[PDB]
Every structure is written in structure tokens, then in C-alpha cells.
Design a protein around this ligand. Sequence first.
Ligand SMILES: [Mg+2]
Length: 679
Amino acid sequence: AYIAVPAVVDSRSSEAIGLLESFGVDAGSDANDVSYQDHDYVVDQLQYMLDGYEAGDVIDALVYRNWLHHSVYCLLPPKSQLLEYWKSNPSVIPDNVDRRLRKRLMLKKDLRKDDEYNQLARAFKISDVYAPLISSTTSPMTMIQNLNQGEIVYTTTDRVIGARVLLYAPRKYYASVPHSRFNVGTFPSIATPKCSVMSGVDIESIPNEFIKLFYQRVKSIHANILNDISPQIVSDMINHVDVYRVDVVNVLFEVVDVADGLRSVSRKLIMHTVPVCILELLGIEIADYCIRQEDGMFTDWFLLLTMLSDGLTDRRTHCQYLINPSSMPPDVILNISITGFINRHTIDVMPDVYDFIKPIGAVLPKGSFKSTIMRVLDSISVLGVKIMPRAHVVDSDEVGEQMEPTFEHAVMEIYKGIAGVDSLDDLTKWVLNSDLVPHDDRLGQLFQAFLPLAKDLLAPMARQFYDNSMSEGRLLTFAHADSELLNANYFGHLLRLKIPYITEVNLMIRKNREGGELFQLVLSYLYKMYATSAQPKWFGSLLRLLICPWLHMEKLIGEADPASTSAEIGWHVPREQLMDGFIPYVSIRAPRLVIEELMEKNWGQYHAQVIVTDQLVVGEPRRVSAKAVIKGNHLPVKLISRFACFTLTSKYEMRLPCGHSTGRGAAYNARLAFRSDLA
RNA sequence: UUUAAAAAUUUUAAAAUAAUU
RNA sequence: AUAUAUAUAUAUUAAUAUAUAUAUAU
RNA sequence: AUAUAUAUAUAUAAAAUUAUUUUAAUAUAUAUAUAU
Ligand SMILES: [Mg+2]
């Protein structure tokens, strides 16, 4: 038998990870008959072969492979070096080769200029000697056919796909498996009657993007002849822990209005890739739930779910939904009822944009729940780590509040430029009519005045504020539009974000804000008009990274020794220059065997000017604030491998638990240095 | 009966000088 | 005695900054 | 923890349009002619 899965299957590691409990199969037992297959090199060959050929030809060829039929290529050097190898060590010559050619190669002459051997080599071709010879222009369908029928195939090129490539001659003449009745691996085929494909995982959620292309192309042409089997059917047929790889499903639920004992389904939705660990933690299963529980504010485990995922779309009309944040009708979600779970798979929580250790700027619209998400995020501290303290995050209003006329006060006086308004309430009435969605022309006349305030005041103030903030440690900073972080030249990762709710209603729900609620809302419209359209991309994309890796590591280092499983890596200054103390800058947490490996890495080729001060901090541990400015290069994440759970924010500060006296401050030209205990 | 029209192609890849965006 | 071209032959392949180790002194 | 001398290694400076000038021995030896 043979089964194909949407994932890169390997015979070494895929047994360790399993992949079958991954996709949701109950293979767990003394099964030892589901033998995997090596498709790493096959994916690499597919990528290399799409470079020259066409995707349709390559995929429609590779689909007709009999993966349970062992075979192999072996490439020949070109004709010249081939003949050189025929000559030297001549007792390997196939008998097809011409009698004259063999009789002339068996001679010990220099072969400098043999008048007849030159002709005999000119009229010699490789294709006649070795029978199955693929081509330099094979037009690959015969490649897969010849791999299907036979044991060895002879190529004169490297662009081949289907099996491994073996060398024919020694390296000089070139330039620079048992079955188990339940074989599995990627790349479905239709070679036999027993090839099956495991359904249950959507096509748009496949993460590899080459397996994804292969599946799309094969499933749009061979839909009616493929054998689909779900994870339950596969289960019935059968019957250095990596962090940042989490299992995700999505929840199927509908809205219910249980008034006076009469159930009434109202709407059906899909939560779109909440991670499985959070559903396990919160104890979510098939039952009814109330998602407010008091005073019309969400119960906040529901808020955590909605903020840890992508967004929910209606199942009737396949479009996004954006559930209502208020508690006023027409639409109010007060009671839901989860009904099932569909496609499960792993994803890489580490975004590709994040490779170096640097600050993070998360742009959100105005009316989002930034305050409540901060209140909910500052509490988590898994292994005594405090993954996101409240002091490491920069509020969105801070850069505008630090001005003599603050920014919002500066824009409140904008009604003087209009032809005639005479008051802020008349401005809010002249802009949007008797609901939101203001008049676009009037909003444009207002934006032409709002813009110079944002380009001439806010940008110059922010260009200094973000520098001052970057000096004193990594911080997670928010904003109301990417243009704020782009005009003011912001350093760090620029993550746009978005929330699954209607943010414009929060601007009416919240009361005690400067100016009327209508003014806050018009201000949000102006920021949204100053936005430079680009994909906001689902706020949960960040919170999933923030939370998920720690929960997994808590299973591995839940009970080990804190001294043996810990570390900290900061800027070092020698015991002199007191006219040793290091600023932390990072706090690693990982098993002992990886701390041993991190203990020996360089960590010293990274420099920065640390400027210690003499100011005291109200916090308990007696410590003095400091600063630091990296010079040359930034710490890449590869050093802190995928097996440790580090922190993303940190303040710069030094503790002084010896001879308490703060003298004069200074700059010292620190050097990075690993700092753990004995372990 | 002897003479003659002859091809005006490119975008010419790099290295130095000068002018410009 | 010098050089140029003619035929052949032969060999042949073409500023600043930083890091590391040695030594001497503190 | 540092200073000086030494040795080794590394990083840094672009694209386009226009016009002009230069890019088939490397060397020697024998036989031929010529010039100084
Ligand atoms: Mg210019």
C-alpha cells in the first residue's frame, strides 16, 4: 500500500515527529509497519527541475511514478572524459562498443594524433552503447516510464527527478530499502490500484508551496480517479524537540440565541487555525458556551481564542465576518456552540521576516483592543520568565502625548481651516452624516489639513522618540498606521496587524476620551486614510509566536533543575572601570543539552557602546539603568537555535549588589558574553 | 563591343577621459 | 655589431576600521 | 584587565545615457631580405 500526505516525509525524522498524530491519525501503538519514504531529495529535484522545464510537464510526469518500485539513475561524464575513462582502467568496457574502438583503446600509444581514431571517436555516440539513455532534451515522461520499468537508468545530465543520482566514473572525470505494507510519503501517484491520498487538509493551508503546487495541479486534473481517505479511515486501516512548530485546527461553531428555552441557530462560522495547545489548555470541547459572562464584555478566553488565530468567515457566504464588539442589535453574539474540528496540520510559527534580534513595531487600527490585550498579555509568565512585561511595550499614544500642545489637541483646532465650522461638534456633524461612513469629499477637505500636522510635527517628534526608545533596550511599539513608522524612520521589524472585530464600534463604546466619541472616530478615519494600503495580516500571527513556544517548552523543562536549564546573554564590562556587571539583553530557557551547546558558541564578535548611569529604579532589586547601541552587526537568530525559548523584549539596566555607591556613569565599549551558572 | 554601381551594418562587452540624471 | 618583416621549430597559459596568534612590561 | 612591536586576515564605495582613445603572442633559435 501507499499513502500520500501534504508534508515533506522523511525516513529519519518523520518517524520521530511521527506526522500521523500530526495530521490526526491514531497510529500510536506498536505499529512499526507504517514505513516512511525519502522525499527530501525529490522535493529538491522538483525545485531544481522547475528551473528549466515547465511546471505542467514536470508535475504530470512525476505523478506517474511507482514509488514502491526501487530504481536509480547514474549519470555518465561527457564523451571525451568518458573515452578517457574507457582507456585508463579499460577492463570495464561494455561489449556493445565497436570492435575497432575497443581494439584501438586497448593500445598503449600516446594517442596524440591517431588519424583513424579521431574519425572513430567522431562517429561514436553515447546513445547506441547504453540502451536506456535519457537525454539532454528528454522531454520528461520517458524518464518516469524508464524508472517504472527497470532497475538502472543512464543519464547524461543532472536535471532528473524520481530517484537518486549515482556516479559512474570516479570524481576526477566530473566538474565540481525494504517495504512495510503501509508505505507513506508526499507526492501522490496513480501508478497502482493501491495508491491513496489522505484528504482532510485544505489546499490553501499547505505550507511548503512546492507540495502545494503539486497538489493543486494534480487535483485539478485527476480529481475523479484519485482515492481519498480521511484520517479516521487511515487509522482504521492501520489498526532535540523543535519548538515553533505547533499543531493548528479550526473550530466549527454557530451562534445561538437561547431566550426563554427556545434554541435558534442563527449563523455558522469557522475560526481558521487556532493552535491545538490553547484549546487543550482552556478545556474546549463540543458544548454550549457564553462568551460574555458579565456586563457585555467578552469572557476573554474567547478573546484569547479570537486573538490567537486567523479570522472567522461565514459558511453560507464564503466571506470574512468580523464579529460585533458591542452589545447592541441587529447582531450580537452572546451564546455559541462548538460543533467540530476540521483540518489539522503543523505550521512554522517563526515568521521569515524575523531573522535578526531587533525591536518590533506592531501597527494596529485605532479602535482595537490594545489596552485589554496588554492587560491580558502582561500576566503570562510561564517558567518565571514574564514573557511580555507591561514596561517593555510602548503605548500607541505615547509619541503624541509628549508635546506641549499634544497631537490630538493640535488636531482638535483643525476646524479653523475649514470654510466654516465654528466648533468641534459642527465639524463632527459636517463630516459623517447620521451614521458613520462620512462624506468622502468633506473627509478629503479635512484630510488636506490633517496631513501637514502629521508630516511636520508628528514625524519629526517620532524620529527622535523612537531613537531614544531604541537606545534603552528592545521594546514592542504600537502605532495607528504604517506611515507613522515609515516617515519617522523606524528601525526594527514592521509588522502590520489586524483584529477580527469591527473596530469602529469601540470608538462609540468607550466613554472618557479627549473630544467626543465622534471626534475619536473621525480621527481614526484620518489615520486609516493615511495608511498606504498593504495587507494587515491577522494580529494573531504575532501572539501565536509570543505564547505558543513557551507552552511547549514548559512540558520539556517543567520539572528539571532551574540552574541546569537557564541562561542569560548580555553586554560585559571588566571588573575594572568602576571609576563585573553586565546588562542582560536576553534570557534563554531551554533543556540542559542545548544549554551545553550554546555555552560554546562565539557570542563575542558583537560589540556595542554601553553608557551606564547612576540613576536608581523604584523596582525591588537594586539596579541602575543603562543604555546600549549595537555596532557593526545584529545578533542573528540562528545562534539561539530553534530549540530554545528566548524573550523578544528587554530593558537595559545593571544591578549593583556590592559596595553600594553609584559613581559618575560612563561609556565602556562592552562585548557580548554568554552568562549561565555551572549547570 | 568595353566600363562600372560594390555592403552604411551595430546599439560594440569590457578598461581610461569628459558631459549629464 | 643593432633593429624590422618572411617560413618553420620549441617551451608555454597567462587610505579608515576590525579580528586572530607571538613577545615584553604592569 | 591593559599598553607597545611583529605576523596574518577581513569589511567599504552603484545604475544609466552621450562622445572620444586603446584591447590576436608570451619568448627564443635556425634560413631570407632590408635599414642603422
Ligand atoms: Mg539630479
